[PDB]
Amino acid sequence: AALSIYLENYATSMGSREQLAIAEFARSLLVIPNTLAVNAAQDSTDLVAKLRAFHNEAQ
Amino acid sequence: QFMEETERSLHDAIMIVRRAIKNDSVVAGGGAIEMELSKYLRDYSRTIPGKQQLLIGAYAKALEIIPRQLCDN
Amino acid sequence: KSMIEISRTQDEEVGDGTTSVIILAGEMLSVAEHFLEQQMHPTVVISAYRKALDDMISTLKKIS
């Protein structure tokens, strides 16, 4: 989740088409909490939204 | 045909200036605010969600489509 | 084919009750599953199947 936070700023100040490529690479990062909660028989979209909600800065 | 576009050139200045008088509270045009508001509200998608980053992210996804279309038209 | 294999399991340990092990296993997955796999929680029903086992064990000591 934090790598997705680490890359959206890295997308934002990049410039051109590469910005959208950094962001969709961060969309591939989100599947790892997603496959676990389904395997743990829980909600994936809830749990990953909990993760990013715990934050001060991206570390 | 030059005067057809010239009339609608003048008509745009009539529409925007009458609108500028009735509301002094004026921002920039061209969807310039929306791209900021796209990134502004995805920060709330970073901030708030229990599940709401799917919605506010989609909300902020649709905001940049207007200057996207204004580039695409 | 796996129903034969768990019947081979009961046969090699006992040989009896192999008729009966396949009877009980049907309605476990017949009754619970479609109500809950439309809700899709596989792991919870596994742990529910865990706690169905040991409660039966203590109840065996109650009745025997």
Swiss-Prot record, chain A:
UniProt-annotated location(s): Cytoplasm, Cytosol; Cytoplasm, Cytoskeleton, Microtubule organizing center, Centrosome
Coiled coil feature spans: none
Role description: Component of the chaperonin-containing T-complex (TRiC), a molecular chaperone complex that assists the folding of actin, tubulin and other proteins upon ATP hydrolysis. The TRiC complex mediates the folding of WRAP53/TCAB1, thereby regulating telomere maintenance. As part of the TRiC complex may play a role in the assembly of BBSome, a complex involved in ciliogenesis regulating transports vesicles to the cilia.
Associated pathology: Intellectual developmental disorder with polymicrogyria and seizures: An autosomal dominant neurologic disorder characterized by a broad phenotypic spectrum. Main clinical features are developmental delay of varying severity, intellectual disability, seizures, and polymicrogyria. Additional variable features are non-specific pyramidal or cerebellar signs, and visual impairment.
Family membership: Belongs to the TCP-1 chaperonin family.
Quaternary structure and interacting proteins, as annotated: Component of the chaperonin-containing T-complex (TRiC), a hexadecamer composed of two identical back-to-back stacked rings enclosing a protein folding chamber. Each ring is made up of eight different subunits: TCP1/CCT1, CCT2, CCT3, CCT4, CCT5, CCT6A/CCT6, CCT7, CCT8. Interacts with PACRG. Interacts with GBA1. Interacts with DLEC1.
Name of the protein this chain belongs to: T-complex protein 1 subunit alpha
Taxonomic lineage from the root: Eukaryota, Metazoa, Chordata, Craniata, Vertebrata
Originating gene: TCP1
Residues of the full protein shown: 417 to 475 of 556
Curated annotation (Swiss-Prot), chain B:
Protein family (similarity comment): Belongs to the TCP-1 chaperonin family.
Functional note: Component of the chaperonin-containing T-complex (TRiC), a molecular chaperone complex that assists the folding of actin, tubulin and other proteins upon ATP hydrolysis. The TRiC complex mediates the folding of WRAP53/TCAB1, thereby regulating telomere maintenance.
Signal sequence region: none
UniProt-annotated location(s): Cytoplasm
Disease (UniProt): De novo genetic variants in nearly every subunit of the TRiC complex, including CCT7, have been found in individuals with a broad spectrum of brain malformations, and clinical phenotypes ranging from mild to severe epilepsy, developmental delay, intellectual disability, ataxia, and other features of cerebral malfunction.
Cross-link Glycyl lysine isopeptide (Lys-Gly) (interchain with G-Cter in SUMO2) placement: 51
Name under which the protein is recorded: T-complex protein 1 subunit eta
Binding positions for ATP per the UniProt entry: 19, 30
Disulfide bonds: none
Record text on subunit structure and interactions: Component of the chaperonin-containing T-complex (TRiC), a hexadecamer composed of two identical back-to-back stacked rings enclosing a protein folding chamber. Each ring is made up of eight different subunits: TCP1/CCT1, CCT2, CCT3, CCT4, CCT5, CCT6A/CCT6, CCT7, CCT8. Interacts with PACRG. Interacts with DLEC1.
Binding locations of ADP: 30
First-to-last residue of the parent protein present: 380 to 452 of 543
UniProtKB/Swiss-Prot annotation, chain C:
Residues reported in the UniProt entry to bind ATP: 17-19
Binding, Mg(2+): 16
Binding, ADP: 17-20
Subcellular location: Cytoplasm
Function: Component of the chaperonin-containing T-complex (TRiC), a molecular chaperone complex that assists the folding of actin, tubulin and other proteins upon ATP hydrolysis. The TRiC complex mediates the folding of WRAP53/TCAB1, thereby regulating telomere maintenance. As part of the TRiC complex may play a role in the assembly of BBSome, a complex involved in ciliogenesis regulating transports vesicles to the cilia.
Quaternary data: Component of the chaperonin-containing T-complex (TRiC), a hexadecamer composed of two identical back-to-back stacked rings enclosing a protein folding chamber. Each ring is made up of eight different subunits: TCP1/CCT1, CCT2, CCT3, CCT4, CCT5, CCT6A/CCT6, CCT7, CCT8. Interacts with PACRG. Interacts with DNAAF4. Interacts with DLEC1.
Family membership: Belongs to the TCP-1 chaperonin family.
Record's disease association: Neurodevelopmental disorder with speech or visual impairment and brain hypomyelination: An autosomal dominant disorder characterized by global developmental delay, impaired intellectual development, poor or absent speech, and brain abnormalities including hypomyelination, cerebellar atrophy, and optic nerve atrophy. Some patients have severe visual impairment, dystonic movements, and seizures.
The protein, known as: T-complex protein 1 subunit gamma
Annotated source species: Homo sapiens
